[PDB]
Design a protein around this ligand. Structure first.
Ligand code: NAP
Ligand code: NAP
Ligand code: NAP
Ligand code: NAP
Lengths: 338, 338, 338, 338
């Protein structure tokens, strides 16, 4: 039926998640609270005007400590300490952790101590303790009691995994490598400034910047048969949104370009309907802004070297597509609370 | 002689100041310490590799708590609290305040309490108490004991002031307005994120963003006769460095384009030699990267409407040009300690 | 009732005009043909996928020599010589000249020789012979027989004129100056390459580039009382669309910021309803993508120096807003053919 | 000795080649003429001011039909038809074909018909007939009389080939794939405009744009043993210069990361000295502007999956690095005319 949801960290994913939610047909979610760093005024304003999604077409208003959208009112709070949040009193079942700062089991659990029952990290979990799910890959393995702290993995892993599942099922992945040409994010710097990563420290809009990614190793979390078989890197480039994955895998079953495309397209219409979009048009990155699928296979770019070495390129709106999946995963949690 | 200087905040201006210094012919400054937020390693790395200035061609090395450039060793320390700094013990005479967080007389003076004798804010001073100087405009009014907390004003004010002086001296400014088309800075956000200023909160590299500026009112600090006579706004645009000033003034002495140019040039060769550069080539913004002058008059763009309404456009490398001036001001202070 | 229209030059304005047209309530236009440089395939594809407007939500298809949108079919032709166009045979009443290459009376008239009755240049006319109109400023002065070749002026003039009309009517413009911070266009170069204008020759996305504008002088065409009273320059900056006008005028009737705003807002709700949008929100350039008005006054930026020197900043979507006006002007022509 | 050279097409590569040349220690080339599309004035102006390279520090002057750089005078001519060129009369030995329009044996040979003896295409040759050389890979196979039309291949092939040679020599390449994340070029469009390639038609600075590349198949031209063994695609991204190659190869001799790096470095100090630069610093794209090497191995990004699947990432200044190689190839030809 319905679970009460609160969003912690009203940033890119936070606001994207909200909009996705409001565009949904039906839902078992009731967003009742938002925890942010600024005021209610700033939350309503950044929710309405988005440099990438454009203006949110909806009735948006706000007051000293809440925001209202199309009639639904959501309390606004602002505590940098999750432990101080009124989750218990507000009867919060599920908190969407999208602050980027409570990604460990303990960290994210501070919301449990504060009263919530389950928390969903909109990012990879760090350390042990969190269950990871990727809609369309291991979602049938979701059990309510497994973890109070779950993760929807990263945007890159959500694009990568579905395609890896289809590629592995039909040809058998022996080993593979991947590179993601990714839009810059708020974790990078607009101009040269210190950062734990000497590369993300550099002016994002004027540099192609290499950076590590755990996305390839992470698919093992949702497709255990691929443990230690994949890896790769990331290249952050000067675009504000949408990215693309370049996956190269040595396959076990010799095949041909027309065929890997055939199965990927087959899957986009059936088993990965809604998860994998099959695009055979000569399109560019900004053409996928707002696409709901987690992986957008660009068919005309598929390539097979000597029968067993395949390359597939898949696009993804790392903000919106991902948020659609975190919505799906929350909805999945809803369809089985306690 | 020589005064002992320490840099607080090793950011853009901080590192720009250091490179400017090392490129200088002679100096009365001895930079002996740098207080930054990260480690010595990151400082040496961002000092050498710059996305805008390019590689710093010099012998740069570092250890756990110092960095060495061309044989001169500089201690590295990292305290977010200026009150904890060993200024007294390191015999610090002048501190360059380039953190962007201690811009009030009180704030900056924390350095004084910690032992420094004079502090120079590489930005406008907020509130009462700081002395303000713009090289080439009011530097002859510099007296060592007037203020322990001095300010070199903003980059925009340093470009605007020298041009205002020349225009006012020669035609008499009645009132005027200015707009600066400015490159973005680290005070802006790469993607839509909260900010005190809802406009600076919006993704910098994909927006033209309007923001307020105190630069026009501030020239009064250095040309008192212009108090209440100037005003303006700023438009941040997607370039990482160099900006341009659009100054429109109603003048008292009717004049003509050829003449305002004639006097601006005259000044660039004489009274403003080194402060104002006279450019009559059809150039664009990146052609001014690394220019030492505070103001670069684009002559072919000078315009005079009906004899008393003049418009002059002046470029400026907001990082490098400005940093050259703070070196000049630190040197000015040096040539008169006590 | 209905006039037959053909678009010559299916570029930015060309495709923008078409989409605007298809979004209109009612119309007296029937677009029946498109003359482009490439094939029908390329026309349908660039009409559907736009890096700035996003995907055109409509039924779009094409064949060897035509394109169909939501049932309406439009013949595709491709002749670099207007004189070779089948206007007479296709019974073309009005041709939308948006190739950027037939902007003179003679040039644009080649379409008349080829059979069309009236041609509308989506840009300033060059030389003598063309009538210029700016919806909301001099449209009541439109007579069918005045010119077979008309012009909708430029995007900058359409933003500037409405505001100048309101400002002049209520306070009397003595003289003024203007600067437009404008998105780059296909007339500029992505990288340093030759151009008649040594400044537009320079890499557009990495430079702020000064360039001349005739927009200020042009308002005299639609507001003759302002002949020789205005002028200005342009600054092309790294954004793909939407620009902003900065107008400074010496006024005859002393006034105050609150008041010029009051009249501008008054006009946005009445005499300039649909032409001037009054925005008092702290917004940025990409927030106006797709705005229909020709001028968007940013109120919080309005400024008045010493009572008679005013500055108003107005935004405009130089592609879409402008195209909405060329649609309006074609519709106006329609409401009075012969 | 010395051969008389003429530059056809004074664009990016054209001007880059000229600056590279002037910076060279000794030469066997004498550049005596430049054929461009605009006037001598525009050539001198774009030669001096570069948005990417910065100001050319040299004595540059020009007149109605020549330009002089550091005392060497070069005639300027402007014919779009190579067949009209005074090559015979100016005793031209070698023409540098950098227009990007005469890339077939026949096309380029128009220069030969006009009097030149050998022509060097600064791009891949299209169709049969041209000899291809990549300095450091197959330059010892250069024989003066093999071809009158030679090619220095593409920038991507020049970065890919030296790395392929080293990897193939040491581990044996069975098959492989590569993707180049490339800065945009003048063959791309600033805003959505028609193009033979519907993807290159889309606004370059606001899109990640997929495009085909012949670079991988082309290394076979210079390392025959790799015919049919490599393949790939390109992704154009919003930076104006420097690109990176992502090469994944299935190797015959199992190896480890430390080892592929060990051999790549070994080569950078010996057999590929000056062709391959070994970079083990955490740098980003703009840090490689102005690098002379054809390939810049980013060691920390080297990756080896299960011993026989290697990935190496190599940067390259697609304009400057490439131009240094065409100077090298022109010099190679010079050291063996007839
Ligand atoms: N961007 C993407 O494409 C993407 C894709 C997949 C996963 N993610 C993941 O999503 C998470 C959020 O990233 P984002 O891109 O949306 O960045 P973001 O816009 O910075 O969002 C994080 C939001 O949380 C707020 N915040 C930080 N610490 C907080 C605290 N202690 N309490 C309450 N709010 C706090 C931030 O406030 P201030 O900013 O004001 O400090 C900001 O509003 C990260 O873990 C990231 O890796 C992002
Ligand atoms: N950009 C320009 O062109 C320009 C021109 C004129 C004046 N300014 C002014 O110069 C100042 C510095 O700006 P910027 O552009 O150089 O920005 P910035 O690069 O962020 O520089 C500020 C530096 O201070 C450090 N910092 C922050 N808090 C600190 C603290 N409590 N203690 C010690 N160091 C601290 C920062 O470290 P973290 O970043 O790691 O926190 C960074 O290294 C500002 O007042 C600005 O208005 C800038
Ligand atoms: N961009 C703006 O914001 C804006 C605002 C106001 C006014 N305008 C004016 O609108 C006009 C069009 O500019 P635009 O920005 O839309 O540029 P554009 O996208 O280049 O559009 C011009 C279109 O006309 C085509 N064309 C050129 N010569 C032709 C010929 N002889 N016959 C048939 N088609 C021809 C071009 O083909 P190819 O490109 O394939 O050669 C292109 O498709 C210009 O006069 C401009 O000043 C533009
Ligand atoms: N960009 C790179 O990094 C790179 C690297 C390796 C190879 N290349 C190759 O180098 C070649 C040149 O490309 P580019 O990037 O330098 O582009 P570009 O700057 O456009 O250079 C071509 C030059 O040739 C001129 N031109 C065009 N048609 C001509 C004709 N009929 N006769 C004489 N001159 C003519 C152009 O003038 P107008 O522009 O005024 O028409 C321009 O000066 C291409 O084959 C390209 O694939 C480029």
């Amino acid at each position: 039926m319905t679970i009460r949801v609160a969003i912690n960290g009203f940033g890119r994913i936070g606001r994207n998640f909200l909009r996705c939610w409001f565009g949904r047909q039906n839902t078992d979610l009731e967003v009742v609270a938002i925890n942010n760093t600024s005021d209610a005024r700033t939350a309503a304003h950044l929710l309405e005007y988005d440099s990438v999604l454009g203006r949110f077409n909806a009735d948006i208003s706000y007051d000293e400590n809440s925001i209202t959208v199309n009639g639904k009112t959501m309390k606004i709070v602002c505590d940098r300490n999750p432990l101080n949040l009124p989750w218990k009193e507000w009867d919060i079942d599920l908190v969407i952790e999208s602050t980027g700062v409570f990604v460990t089991a303990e960290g994210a659990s501070k919301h449990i101590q504060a009263g919530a029952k389950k928390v969903l990290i909109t990012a990879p979990g760090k350390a042990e303790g969190v269950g990871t799910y990727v809609i369309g890959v291991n979602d049938s393995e979701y059990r309510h009691e497994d973890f109070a702290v779950i993760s929807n993995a990263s945007c890159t892993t959500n694009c990568l995994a579905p395609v890896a599942k289809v590629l592995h099922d039909n040809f058998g992945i022996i080993k593979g490598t991947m590179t993601t040409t990714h839009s810059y994010t708020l974790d990078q710097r607009i101009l040269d400034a210190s950062h734990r990563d000497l590369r993300r420290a550099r002016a994002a809009a004027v540099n192609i910047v290499p950076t590590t990614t755990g996305a390839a190793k992470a698919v093992a979390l949702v497709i255990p048969e691929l443990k230690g078989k994949l890896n790769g890197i990331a290249l952050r480039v000067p675009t504000p949104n949408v990215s693309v994955v370049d996956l190269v895998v040595q396959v076990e079953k010799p095949t041909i370009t027309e065929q890997v495309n055939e199965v990927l397209q087959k899957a986009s219409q059936t088993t990965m309907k809604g998860i994998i979009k099959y695009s055979d048009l000569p399109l560019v990155s900004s053409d996928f802004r707002g696409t709901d699928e987690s992986s957008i296979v660009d068919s005309s770019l598929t390539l097979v070297m000597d029968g067993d070495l395949v390359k597939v390129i898949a696009w993804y709106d790392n903000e919106w597509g991902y948020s659609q999946r975190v919505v799906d995963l929350a909805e999945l949690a809803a369809r089985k609370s306690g």
